[PDB]
Amino acid sequence: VKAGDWLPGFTPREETVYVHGGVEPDPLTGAILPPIYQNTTFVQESVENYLSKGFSYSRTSNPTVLSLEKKIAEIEGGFGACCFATGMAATVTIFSAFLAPGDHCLVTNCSYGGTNRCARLHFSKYNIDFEFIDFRDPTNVEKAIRPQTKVVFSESPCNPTLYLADIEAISQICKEKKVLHVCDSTFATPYMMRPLDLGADIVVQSTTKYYDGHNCTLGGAVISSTKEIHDKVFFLRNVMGNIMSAQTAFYTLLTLKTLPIRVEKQSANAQKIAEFLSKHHKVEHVIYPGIPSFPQKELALKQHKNVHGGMLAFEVKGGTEAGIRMMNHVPRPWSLCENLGACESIITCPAVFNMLREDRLKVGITDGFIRVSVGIEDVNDLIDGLDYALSKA
Amino acid sequence: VKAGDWLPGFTPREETVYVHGGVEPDPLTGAILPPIYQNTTFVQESVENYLSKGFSYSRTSNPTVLSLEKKIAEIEGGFGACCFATGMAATVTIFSAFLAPGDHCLVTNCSYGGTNRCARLHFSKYNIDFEFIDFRDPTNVEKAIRPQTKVVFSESPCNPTLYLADIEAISQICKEKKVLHVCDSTFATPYMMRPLDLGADIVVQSTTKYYDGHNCTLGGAVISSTKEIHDKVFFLRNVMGNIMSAQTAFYTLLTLKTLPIRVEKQSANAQKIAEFLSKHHKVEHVIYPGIPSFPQKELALKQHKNVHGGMLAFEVKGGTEAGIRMMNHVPRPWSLCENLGACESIITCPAVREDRLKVGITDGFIRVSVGIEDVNDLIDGLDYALSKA
Amino acid sequence: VKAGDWLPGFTPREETVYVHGGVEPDPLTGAILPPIYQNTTFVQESVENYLSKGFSYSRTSNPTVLSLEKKIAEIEGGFGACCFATGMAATVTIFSAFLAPGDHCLVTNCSYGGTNRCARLHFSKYNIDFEFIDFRDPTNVEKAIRPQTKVVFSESPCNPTLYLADIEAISQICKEKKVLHVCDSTFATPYMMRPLDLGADIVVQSTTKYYDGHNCTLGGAVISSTKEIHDKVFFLRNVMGNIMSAQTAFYTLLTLKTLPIRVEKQSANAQKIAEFLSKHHKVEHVIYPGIPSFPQKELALKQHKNVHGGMLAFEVKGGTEAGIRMMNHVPRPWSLCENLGACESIITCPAVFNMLREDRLKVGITDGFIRVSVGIEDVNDLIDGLDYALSKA
Amino acid sequence: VKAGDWLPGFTPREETVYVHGGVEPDPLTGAILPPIYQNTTFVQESVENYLSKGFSYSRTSNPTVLSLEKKIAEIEGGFGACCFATGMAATVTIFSAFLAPGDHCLVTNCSYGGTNRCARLHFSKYNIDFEFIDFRDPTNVEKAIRPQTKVVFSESPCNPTLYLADIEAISQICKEKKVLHVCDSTFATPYMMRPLDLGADIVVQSTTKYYDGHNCTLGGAVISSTKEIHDKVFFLRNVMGNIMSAQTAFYTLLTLKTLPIRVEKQSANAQKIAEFLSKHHKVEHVIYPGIPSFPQKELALKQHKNVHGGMLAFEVKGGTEAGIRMMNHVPRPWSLCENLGACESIITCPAVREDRLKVGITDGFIRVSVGIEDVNDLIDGLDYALSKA
Numbered sequence A, C: 001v002k003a004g005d006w007l008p009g010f011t012p013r014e015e016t017v018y019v020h021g022g023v024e025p026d027p028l029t030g031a032i033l034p035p036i037y038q039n040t041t042f043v044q045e046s047v048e049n050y051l052s053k054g055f056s057y058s059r060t061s062n063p064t065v066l067s068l069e070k071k072i073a074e075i076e077g078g079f080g081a082c083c084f085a086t087g088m089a090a091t092v093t094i095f096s097a098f099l100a101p102g103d104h105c106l107v108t109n110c111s112y113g114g115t116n117r118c119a120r121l122h123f124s125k126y127n128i129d130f131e132f133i134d135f136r137d138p139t140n141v142e143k144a145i146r147p148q149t150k151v152v153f154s155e156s157p158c159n160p161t162l163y164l165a166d167i168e169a170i171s172q173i174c175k176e177k178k179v180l181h182v183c184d185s186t187f188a189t190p191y192m193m194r195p196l197d198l199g200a201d202i203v204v205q206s207t208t209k210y211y212d213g214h215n216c217t218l219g220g221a222v223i224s225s226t227k228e229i230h231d232k233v234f235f236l237r238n239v240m241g242n243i244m245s246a247q248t249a250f251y252t253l254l255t256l257k258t259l260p261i262r263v264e265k266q267s268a269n270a271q272k273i274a275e276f277l278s279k280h281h282k283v284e285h286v287i288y289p290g291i292p293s294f295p296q297k298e299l300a301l302k303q304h305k306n307v308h309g310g311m312l313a314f315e316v317k318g319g320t321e322a323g324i325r326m327m328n329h330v331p332r333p334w335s336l337c338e339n340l341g342a343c344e345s346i347i348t349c350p351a352v353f354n355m356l357r358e359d360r361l362k363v364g365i366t367d368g369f370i371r372v373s374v375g376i377e378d379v380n381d382l383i384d385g386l387d388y389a390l391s392k393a
Numbered sequence B, D: 001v002k003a004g005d006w007l008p009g010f011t012p013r014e015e016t017v018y019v020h021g022g023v024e025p026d027p028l029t030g031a032i033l034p035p036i037y038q039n040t041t042f043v044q045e046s047v048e049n050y051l052s053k054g055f056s057y058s059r060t061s062n063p064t065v066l067s068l069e070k071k072i073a074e075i076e077g078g079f080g081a082c083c084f085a086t087g088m089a090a091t092v093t094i095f096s097a098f099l100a101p102g103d104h105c106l107v108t109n110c111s112y113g114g115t116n117r118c119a120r121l122h123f124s125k126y127n128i129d130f131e132f133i134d135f136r137d138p139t140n141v142e143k144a145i146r147p148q149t150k151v152v153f154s155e156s157p158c159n160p161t162l163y164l165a166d167i168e169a170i171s172q173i174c175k176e177k178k179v180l181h182v183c184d185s186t187f188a189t190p191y192m193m194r195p196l197d198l199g200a201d202i203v204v205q206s207t208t209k210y211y212d213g214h215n216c217t218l219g220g221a222v223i224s225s226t227k228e229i230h231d232k233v234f235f236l237r238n239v240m241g242n243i244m245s246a247q248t249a250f251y252t253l254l255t256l257k258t259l260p261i262r263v264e265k266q267s268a269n270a271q272k273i274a275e276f277l278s279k280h281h282k283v284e285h286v287i288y289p290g291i292p293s294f295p296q297k298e299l300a301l302k303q304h305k306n307v308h309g310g311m312l313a314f315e316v317k318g319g320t321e322a323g324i325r326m327m328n329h330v331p332r333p334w335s336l337c338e339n340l341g342a343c344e345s346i347i348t349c350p351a352v353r354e355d356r357l358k359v360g361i362t363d364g365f366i367r368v369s370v371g372i373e374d375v376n377d378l379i380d381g382l383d384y385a386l387s388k389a
């Protein structure tokens, strides 16, 4: 074994895979990072040697994007990954590939807003029936499967309610039923939970959130457990032209290296903040998978590795008015905006940042429902700011 | 009127719009170029001031992408534009927005391969009927329109045959029929043909090609004639997650500035190369709108402005094997690859299928993208290559 | 000869060199554009194979920067090129390499402000004597050469007066005198004049201006006629750590492709604008190498190929007050700012955008002296805006 | 105090400054990250409003670079910071600004190679006398100060020996002597040592190393304790044309956010690797501030905060050939290259010169940059490599 070779028969440990996975020094120059292939087209040597060097057009595939895809397939435990302009585009590509008119698709009722909206507002017009059910109980899913069900789409934890789905149990049901199991583990990251290890057929990620974790790029990823699934997604990406760009792939290859340490820090910070809010006289409920009153504590302890994540939610006593005063008074370092998973701590109120009382209520997004993405700042500053805002609420 | 203002009541001339349309110096700093908003989210000042600064999340809209969209809307003469990760995503978004199960869509039979394939192989599974017809006679279009027809999709010039479609007549037909006319004018560029000026309801562009013209970025654009259409596209883009990145948009804002002079040069070179090939004994036919042998020269002279474009095609005597030997022996500066519209001259023979000769792509059919190299190097390379055919 | 080879024994024509010079498809993937080597360090195969792949540290050299350097050396007719963070850094590196205390350096008295300032304010403290003389007459230079003269630094055309220097004649003198001839041909571009073809030893370029021509990047280049000179510059760049970045190199590799067509359009526009101003009753003098009253018309016709450039200057009747009203009233498309050579037409007043009357007068930068960089907009818009501003002056 | 404001009278804690220092949401859009001002010039509103928006030309200053400079000034506790294309340009600019013919400058004898070489081989031709001495005893510094001495240049820890300099004592010596103290704390990072807090007049940083920590960018920074010093540096940077690019500054603004957790991890790994090597029979000596065998452990415990850093060094028994065989057989995840401070673990043996052993770099001297990989992979690779020594 020489410098540049890995030791044979060794599987690199996890953090090493985050640092190096799917990437070796440039063969041509030894460049330690992958060069950015900011180019549209790739010259062919001859008609007979078409694609011999593996590339022809970046809408189809691109060397930088491919390096990122390989690293992501390694980190998530999948056969192959496909990288997309956004997480919404990865989601939409799954829905586009595996559903046809007359098909049934069970979706967690607490899915990300955008996922729900793309299902109801758009894909339903193709006479695809999306049924949104409670995924907390796996028997609910098992018995909601119909003969037209082709896809079961789980999310865990859920955006923003933080409800968990038992991925292993649902995967068990879907295998027995011969149904595709797709799971959106954006809130979890592979550091906390890898649905493909838990039996999922497909994982969808918004790399915008934690993969990036820097509020820098948009991106999506579809990680497939088999070559058939992977090739289907690959084909449809080429057709829908929603592939990720080389520059975004570079950014994400760079930010993935620190995902484990980032998520550890965010999660410790979030554990402390959730405990603080748990004791606060102005706070009505606190949802965080790591505090002992979490209603799905057992599933969390079963399913979450290392951490319980950077996301939490709470409710301020007083209702919408108090929540709004609180939001309007949360100071820096906090940011009042959308997105999550970033180094920068973010706070938002999903119910004021278009629908009706009863929907957001049945969903769990109450009127004072504040969603919180914890970053890597000093937790004492973050709690100072929350405490101030709360005294103002 | 002081420094930094456009004169009220005056309209910039064409090239000025390419340089400056949709962009002003940065209000905060005066930066002559718009900064790159390489950021995903935008901080809101309060709950009630939500969106007061115009942005929330870059998947929905981004300032750099918006400046490019304003430029493109100005260049193509439309109400609004939306920018996409690719031309194929733009096309797909039109299909997704304006078709439903049971609808009918007429598509030019000589469309870009990708368009034909996403229609026939994906959207057709939603029980959408795509009919491919010959758009060279607008009477065909008029006769083929059904009551379920929602979209007529033209492309002019066509890839790779360079067939032309009469955008104005087709638009009058669709207006009378209240059907949406979408035109893919990627091969023309707005510098030679603007379908919105000719009555098209929507324009689709692969900005990858000429807008970029540098082999650098991928991109797509949908330019909408009306606010209703543009709002629909915008909403669907947000739902599809196929918006263009801010970095890409910065690149394209940069490269658009030289589109007029780039296309002037490419078309000069293309005219010269077409005349050269028109005389070569190894060459069966030459297709370029700028030579008298062009079948649709009347429509060409009516519809094309400034130039006849950087794209041409030609047939080499001897069929597929001849074309292949030529390709294998085309020297630099030519590049054998995909893509078109670049400063780098590109040659390809898409053949290397009885529906090919129905789509007009024959055995020795060679599509040629003329760049801005010295035309003598390009012609000398072509002449050598042909000596090996 | 196969696809990917050039025809043997052919020298590619000029515009072809701008499009392709110093760049071939990526050997590894066939990528038509050079990949961006956004990386600091390059992995070595072994101790004995150190530098075998040619790179180790991007402060010293970088593959993207090297591609740009090769293209630039081709376009300018030099042995080798060295690319720098800015044009000021290239200039400073020349001054740093070839002057020592006690040395004499003749500089054109109408050099770029920054060049003059770095000479007087900084390098003079090393007891280097910079003598600034009129370069319009080559005999002035010949007879101003002293035994301590090591460097003759010409600029042509000059920023902003547009004075020309007879590069061939000065090169002749410097050869006979055994003195280094450096020429800053930023205003000219190699499309109009290549001092290395005219006998210069070194060419300095601010690639910020026309190489870029898009107001996008900063950059500098030093093109050396011999390997000795080139290696000296290379060493000193590594030591002073002012190399250009891979990303800026990519941008410039991309913008160089259109330099010929850009400069043709800018120059036609500038010829028209200079004629218009030549006829304008509010304009006192107009300087443009292309109009028939240019005082150095003969040298211009001798020395300029294809074009007379995008730069012009004029003076408004009325003095500083009229000039200021005019500047304050020039509308878009014009931009009131610094820089030049860009697609965007730019106007500025060097004498109000810190010194004294008599210096700016002896220099030629009069009080109403407006410098104009013409872009590629529609010339009718540009003349409309100038005419408006002038009616306002 | 509403959303978007810092509480008046409060000072952010350390890690918060790494995330947020010197940056606010974009006033125009609310963009949570500052846009990239990839532009050369800035449009002025009028002749008299010249510079009213703060910018004119990116060689002189640029908004992205300025936001990074504000962050860095906050992190290092200085009046101001200027950013440069590289660490070497920062060092060079200090030498250019503060030395003149006939001046004297004391420089640590175990400085980074580049610093020693730009002094001995370039600036010495301006009749500037550079004296290289042993900074481990501040009495040496005090005794070596001449009336022509203008700059004392310390570096702590030193590259590659990891010698420490007592920044506080040296600063007191230079204060009494009214000589400028510049400290290159590149190896320490402000997370472990901030020389400005210890009395240094100037800090120089290669942001290439830990500030970046990703092997991505080159960069330098000069942090000035006073406005006089900072204005001098700024003026000279404008004259030298060696400012940092806006894109680089964007990258570094990004990577700085994780510097604390990166360095925490690297130093944990480094402590474990040093303890491992301290026990290996093939290893002569191990140099890491965090083990009891460290000669300057008292100064280490006094001057280092939080961690003892990601850098270590060690000597392999058998000399140069042993070190070389080890290097040739260090496996992945290790990278054999230059640079340090990255998430990617890097190893090198700078030897492959009687002044080497005067500068303390022996035959089997191996400098090691510990990244954030799993320490077991790193130790296993080192153990194999050593089995081949």
Ligand SMILES: *Cc1c(COP(=O)(O)O)cnc(C)c1O
Pocket (backbone or CB within 6 Å): A086, A087, A088, A089, A091, A112, A114, A115, A155, A159, A184, A186, A187, A205, A206, A207, A208, A209, A218, A219, A220, B059, B241
């Ligand atoms: C944000 C999100 C998405 C959408 O991904 P984008 O990158 O914003 O398009 C999908 N799933 C979850 C859980 C998400 O949070």
Ligand SMILES: *Cc1c(COP(=O)(O)O)cnc(C)c1O
Pocket (backbone or CB within 6 Å): A059, A241, B086, B087, B088, B089, B091, B112, B114, B155, B159, B184, B186, B187, B205, B206, B207, B208, B218, B219, B220
């Ligand atoms: C290439 C092309 C497209 C597709 O655009 P992409 O950017 O490659 O996805 C659409 N129409 C035409 C005419 C095209 O040539």
Ligand SMILES: *Cc1c(COP(=O)(O)O)cnc(C)c1O
Pocket (backbone or CB within 6 Å): C086, C087, C088, C089, C091, C112, C114, C115, C155, C159, C184, C186, C187, C205, C206, C207, C208, C209, C218, C219, C220, D059, D241
């Ligand atoms: C602008 C200029 C320079 C300086 O180059 P920068 O890129 O601005 O540092 C040098 N010479 C001339 C003629 C110039 O115009």
Ligand SMILES: *Cc1c(COP(=O)(O)O)cnc(C)c1O
Pocket (backbone or CB within 6 Å): C059, C241, D086, D087, D088, D089, D091, D112, D114, D155, D159, D184, D186, D187, D205, D206, D207, D208, D218, D219, D220
């Ligand atoms: C590398 C280094 C430098 C030089 O910085 P660059 O960015 O490589 O130019 C200066 N000081 C130390 C300690 C260094 O290690």
